C-alpha cells in the first residue's frame, strides 16, 4: 500500500542490488527459498513494500533484473541469494554494451527497453498505491549509464507523480578502470538532472577509504563495497518498513532535502561502522554515532564537504533511543560548526527515528547530505571530459552509433550549468 | 520507570562483538565482512608451500 518497484541495470547495479536484497531478507527474516522464518510480527507487517506474495507463503521480490550482457545474469542467481528472484523478471540482452553509452541508449537498449518496461508495468500496476521507483546502477559502464538513463526517461513519462530514486555509482576521481567513463558520465548527468528526485552519488575510492581507514580490512573486494551501499538503501527506507517514534518515509525526506528541483545529488553515509580491533573500545551511544555520521572519512562520496556548504542535511535513526539528546546535539553540530551550513536556511538538518534497529546492532543510523561540495565531484569530470572532446579521443565509437558532436556539446552545457547552480547558492 | 535503559549506568553492556565467529552479527549487521581474511596467513603459507613443489 506504499510499495516501491525496484529497478537495477548494469553489472554494478545487479551486484549492488543482489547484496541489497540479502540485507533486506536478513532484516525481514527471509530465507533463500523465500519463506518468512524470523522471530517477530514486525518484519512481516510491511513485507509488501519490497516483496510480493506467491502461493505457499512465499515472498517474491519486486525487483526486475536488467543487463545487456548475459554473463552477470548467471552470476546473480548463482549467488547465495539468487533463487529469491522471479525468473520472468530476469530480462536481458544477448550482446554486451562494451562500455558504450551509445549502445545502451540508442543501439542495443532500444530493442530491450520495450521488453523490460512490460515487466516494469507488470510489477508497478499490480500495486494498490505505488510509492515510487528505485534504480541502482553505475555511471562508468555502458548498460549501467546508457540504458540506466533510458529507463529513467520512460518511467518518468509514464509515472510523473510517483517519486524516482537513483543510487548511481558516479565514476571514481583518481583511480579508474575504463578510459571512456568520462564520456559515459558526462552523457548521463543531463538525464539524471531532469528526471530524478533523489540521486545518491557513491564513489569507489570513498568506499575504499572507508574500508581502509575506518574498517581496516586486509583485502577488500566488491562484496564489501556492495555491503556498505546496501546499508544506505535499507537505512533510507527504514520508515516505510518499521515503526518509529518520529518516522520519515521516502518522499517526506525528499521534500526538505531539495530546495529546487535540480539540486538533488546527495552523499550517503552509514554511522555505526567500526573495525574489529576497535570494537571493544567503542560504546554504542548516539553522541558518538552522530560524530562519525558527519565525518568526511565516513562519507561514501569522495568529495570533502568542508570545501562547500551543506544545503540540506538529514539523518534517519534506527533503534530504541531518546528524542531529546538527538534533538539537542544535532542542533549542536549546527551551532559548534556553523561555517559549512548555508545561512539562507536556518535549520539545515532533518531528524527521524525508527524503533527497530538492523539485525546485528542495538542501534544504527544513516546519513543523507545535500552539500554544495558535490560540485567538485562533477566539474572534475568536466575537465576530464574536455580533455577528450577537444581532440576527439574515443569519439568514433559514439558518432558511428547514431550520435553527433552536438549531444556532447549540450551535455557539457547542462553539466556546467549544474556546477554553476551550486556555486551561486553557495555564494548567496 | 517505563522506558529507563538510557540512564543510571547501563552503559556496561555488550560491545556488539565479544569475539570472533559469533552467531549474532550476521549480514544485515555491518560488523562482519567478507573482505577480512582471517585465514590470510593460513592461505598464504598454503600458497607459499604450493609454489615450492610447483
Amino acid at each position: 500500500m506504499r510499495e516501491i518497484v525496484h529497478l537495477q541495470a548494469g553489472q554494478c547495479g545487479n551486484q549492488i542490488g543482489a547484496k541489497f536484497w540479502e540485507v533486506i531478507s536478513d532484516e525481514h527474516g527471509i530465507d533463500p527459498t523465500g519463506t518468512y522464518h524470523g522471530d517477530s510480527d514486525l518484519q512481516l507487517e510491511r513485507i509488501n513494500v519490497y516483496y510480493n506474495e506467491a502461493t505457499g507463503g512465499k515472498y517474491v521480490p519486486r525487483a526486475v533484473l536488467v543487463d545487456l550482457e548475459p554473463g552477470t545474469m548467471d552470476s546473480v542467481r548463482s549467488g547465495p541469494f539468487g533463487q529469491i528472484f522471479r525468473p520472468d523478471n530476469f530480462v536481458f540482452g544477448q550482446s554486451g554494451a562494451g562500455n558504450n553509452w551509445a549502445k545502451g541508449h540508442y543501439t542495443e537498449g532500444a530493442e530491450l527497453v520495450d521488453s523490460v518496461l512490460d515487466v516494469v508495468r507488470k510489477e508497478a500496476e499490480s500495486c494498490d498505491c505505488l510509492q515510487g521507483f528505485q534504480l541502482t546502477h553505475s555511471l562508468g559502464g555502458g548498460t549501467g549509464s546508457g540504458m540506466g538513463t533510458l529507463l529513467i526517461s520512460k518511467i518518468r513519462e509514464e509515472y510523473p507523480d510517483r517519486i524516482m530514486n537513483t543510487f548511481s555509482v558516479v565514476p571514481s576521481p583518481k583511480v579508474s578502470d575504463t578510459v571512456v567513463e568520462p564520456y559515459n558520465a558526462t552523457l548521463s548527468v543531463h538525464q539524471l538532472v531532469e528526471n530524478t528526485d533523489e540521486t545518491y552519488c557513491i564513489d569507489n575510492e570513498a568506499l575504499y577509504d572507508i574500508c581502509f581507514r575506518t574498517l581496516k580490512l586486509t583485502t577488500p573486494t566488491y562484496g564489501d563495497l556492495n555491503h556498505l551501499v546496501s546499508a544506505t538503501m535499507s537505512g533510507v527506507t527504514t520508515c516505510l518498513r518499521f515503526p518509529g517514534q518520529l518516522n520519515a518515509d521516502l518522499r517526506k525526506l525528499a521534500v526538505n532535502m531539495v530546495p529546487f528541483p535540480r539540486l538533488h545529488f546527495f552523499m550517503p553515509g552509514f554511522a555505526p561502522l567500526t573495525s574489529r580491533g576497535s570494537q571493544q573500545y567503542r560504546a554504542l551511544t548516539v553522541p558518538e554515532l552522530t560524530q562519525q555520521m558527519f565525518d568526511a572519512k565516513n562519507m561514501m562520496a569522495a568529495c570533502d564537504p568542508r570545501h562547500g556548504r551543506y544545503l540540506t542535511v538529514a539523518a534517519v535513526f534506527r533503534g530504541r533511543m531518546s528524542m531529546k539528546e538527538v534533538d539537542e546535539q544535532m542542533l549542536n553540530v549546527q551551532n559548534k560548526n556553523s561555517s559549512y551550513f548555508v545561512e539562507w536556511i536556518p535549520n539545515n538538518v532533518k531528524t527521524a527515528v525508527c524503533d527497530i534497529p538492523p539485525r546485528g546492532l542495538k542501534m544504527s543510523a544513516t546519513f543523507i547530505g545535500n552539500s554544495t561540495a558535490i560540485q567538485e565531484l562533477f566539474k572534475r569530470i568536466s575537465e576530464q571530459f574536455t580533455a577528450m572532446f577537444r581532440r576527439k579521443a574515443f569519439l568514433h565509437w559514439y558518432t558511428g552509433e547514431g550520435m553527433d558532436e552536438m549531444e556532447f556539446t549540450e551535455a557539457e552545457s547542462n553539466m556546467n550549468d549544474l556546477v554553476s547552480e551550486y556555486q551561486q547558492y553557495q555564494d548567496a | 520507570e517505563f522506558d529507563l535503559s538510557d540512564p543510571l549506568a547501563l552503559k556496561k553492556d555488550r560491545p556488539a562483538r565479544q569475539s570472533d565467529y559469533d552467531a549474532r552479527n550476521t549480514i544485515s549487521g555491518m560488523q562482519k565482512f567478507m573482505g577480512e581474511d582471517l585465514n590470510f596467513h593460513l592461505r598464504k603459507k598454503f600458497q607459499e608451500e604450493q609454489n615450492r613443489e610447483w
Binding site: 548475459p70 554473463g71 545474469m73 548467471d74 552470476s75 542467481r77 548463482s78 549467488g79 547465495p80 530476469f90 536481458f92 544477448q94 562484496g223 | 567478507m34 585465514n39 592461505r43
Partner: peptide
C-alpha cells in the same frame, strides 16, 4: 575459498568456469 559466495558451481577442478545453463534463449 570464497567461490560459493561467479557463475553456477558445477566444474569441480576450476569453479571459475562459465555456466550458461541460463541465457541461451529457448528458441
Amino acid at each position: 575459498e570464497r567461490a560459493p559466495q561467479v557463475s553456477n558451481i558445477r566444474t569441480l577442478d576450476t569453479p571459475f568456469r562459465k555456466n550458461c545453463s541460463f541465457s541461451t534463449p529457448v528458441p
